[PDB]
Design an enzyme around this catalytic site. Sequence first.
Site, PDB file in Angstrom:
ATOM      1  CG  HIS B  41      83.441  69.071  52.943  1.00 58.52           C
ATOM      2  ND1 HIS B  41      83.691  68.696  54.678  1.00 58.52           N
ATOM      3  CD2 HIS B  41      85.628  68.833  53.149  1.00 58.52           C
ATOM      4  CE1 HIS B  41      84.518  68.152  55.287  1.00 58.52           C
ATOM      5  NE2 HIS B  41      85.566  68.420  54.654  1.00 58.52           N
ATOM      6  N   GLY B 143      92.457  65.509  56.447  1.00 63.00           N
ATOM      7  CA  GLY B 143      91.999  63.979  56.150  1.00 63.00           C
ATOM      8  C   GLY B 143      90.665  63.602  57.377  1.00 63.00           C
ATOM      9  CB  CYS B 145      86.833  65.373  57.253  1.00 65.93           C
ATOM     10  SG  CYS B 145      87.452  67.149  57.533  1.00 65.93           S
TER      11      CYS B 145
HETATM   12 NA    NA Z   1      81.065  69.460  54.732  1.00 65.83          NA
HETATM   13 ZN   LIG Z   2      87.776  68.088  54.885  1.00 65.52          ZN
END
Ligand code: NA
Ligand SMILES: [Zn+2]
Lengths: 305, 305
Positions: B41, B143, B145
Amino acid sequence: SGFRKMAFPSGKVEGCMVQVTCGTTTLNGLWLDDVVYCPRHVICTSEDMLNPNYEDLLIRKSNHNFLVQAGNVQLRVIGHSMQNCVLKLKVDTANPKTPKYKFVRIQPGQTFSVLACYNGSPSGVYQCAMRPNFTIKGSFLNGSCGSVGFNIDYDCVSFCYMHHMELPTGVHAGTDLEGNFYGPFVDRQTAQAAGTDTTITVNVLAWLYAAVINGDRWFLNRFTTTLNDFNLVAMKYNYEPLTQDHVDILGPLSAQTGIAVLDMCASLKELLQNGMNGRTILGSALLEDEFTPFDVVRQCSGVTF
Amino acid sequence: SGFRKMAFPSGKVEGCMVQVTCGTTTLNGLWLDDVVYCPRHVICTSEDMLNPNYEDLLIRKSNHNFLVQAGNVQLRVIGHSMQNCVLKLKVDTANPKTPKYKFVRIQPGQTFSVLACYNGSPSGVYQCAMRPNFTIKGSFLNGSCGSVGFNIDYDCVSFCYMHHMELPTGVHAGTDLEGNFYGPFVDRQTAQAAGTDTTITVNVLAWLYAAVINGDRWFLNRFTTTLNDFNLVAMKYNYEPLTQDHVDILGPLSAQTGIAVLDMCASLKELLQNGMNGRTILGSALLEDEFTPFDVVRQCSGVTF
Ligand code: NA
Ligand SMILES: [Zn+2]
Ligand code: NA
Ligand code: NA
Ligand code: NA
Ligand code: NA
Ligand code: NA
Ligand SMILES: [Zn+2]
């Protein structure tokens, strides 16, 4: 969102941990530039620890008696001295992994990370508070001595603690990196008592602010109180007195949440008088006092290193 | 002695964290050998996240659209592919800080350390459990992730988790390093529910063993029970059923303490039926389920890395 007791990333300190042996005693040292710092009781036998004369014991020891090992690499010791309760061993090699660093003496109620180490090797990292009675509630096995506490700002490590002792009560005592004990403790195996262990009120309030930010608001009540009124309840529950300095440090948290510090004190008051009725705040059934206002602000703003 | 929720020393993982940007989206990547791993993503806008076609979105993207930065150093991307919910970016440079490592898919109830990161920079490290419902209760800001969960054995890092999502309930979901979600979760901003979050019974027992070792014994009672009897109480309190595999894993702890596993179950039973009467175990007012038997053995034996 979410709220965790986070330690600083430990990599900068990992690179500094070494093994120090003198005769049959081994513990952890901290290698910065061309100096290794360790507990002076590295020179002691178990019997010596009952009643050591460190000056007389150290006088029997030469540079060559101090075996300093960093990974598999043996370091050459070209000087030794005792500063308070630490030995400083001069080696002929600057640690190439030496981070930007400072020595600081922290105040009771401040937090820091410990890198728990055995034989100069890191085992784990945890966040804790210097208790108002200058003890820490750690996890220290035989050989953890010389394990260090630190804080990190950007790329700079502030070393604030070195582990020396477990008291007969199972709490931990140690020094700053100039070898001055936090509290009245001495590096001797004799009965020593900590004071009454009080709760760090400013830290409990910071954590209640953390809880509101994350949507745990059940404990917010309709009441307010005064500093004097609050402090009368505080003294009764063995909470540290709250000062105006404490109120000021909580300002940014008060500003974010739109909850006045004294309204949050009235919340705390009712929690103290009524307990939690089997309810939780941020997954705890107890009031948590190991987050500073600085820690809570850090975790909501996302400061990196 | 003493007992702490310790994370693994994070240095080996610090050296692997990078920043990945695709258009106006930035998150964390993990650089091992000549491959950077990140949440797919990274290619999504906030609007895309409502209902992404990742195949169609990725088809618009070339090697040069993926800005990979490790400290100040920009890495050259010479290949990209999507494996499940992760992108693998081939760079032209092997990470020189690449530790010995494995990818492993952990089981519900296992523990690991998270290095919370923002813009490829480490902020902090904490220990947590994969909940039986395959969520984690983390601390993840905008942020975070691509922040990763790991375990360390000697000098080998086992990567087990990558952060992808906060569910509308505020719990965290993510993948193994092959990009397969733990649990039924998808990388889409739609309503998703976790199952009932049960307590990790084997971990609570391991922690009660930890408590006995450290001299918290008040909860030891005169009773015993059976697996079937215990499990009838367990099902009622949303505790995971205890199996004979669980009893076997607790054996070494049973051996050290001289407390049979079923005697400790009878202890647990009474705690569940009577609560703690405002008493604490190892400084907690709740039964702690984020220590495995392996974790408890580790902290009492003092394993290093
Ligand atoms: Na993802
Ligand atoms: Zn994310
Ligand atoms: Na000492
Ligand atoms: Na240390
Ligand atoms: Na101390
Ligand atoms: Na990470
Ligand atoms: Na998940
Ligand atoms: Zn010692």
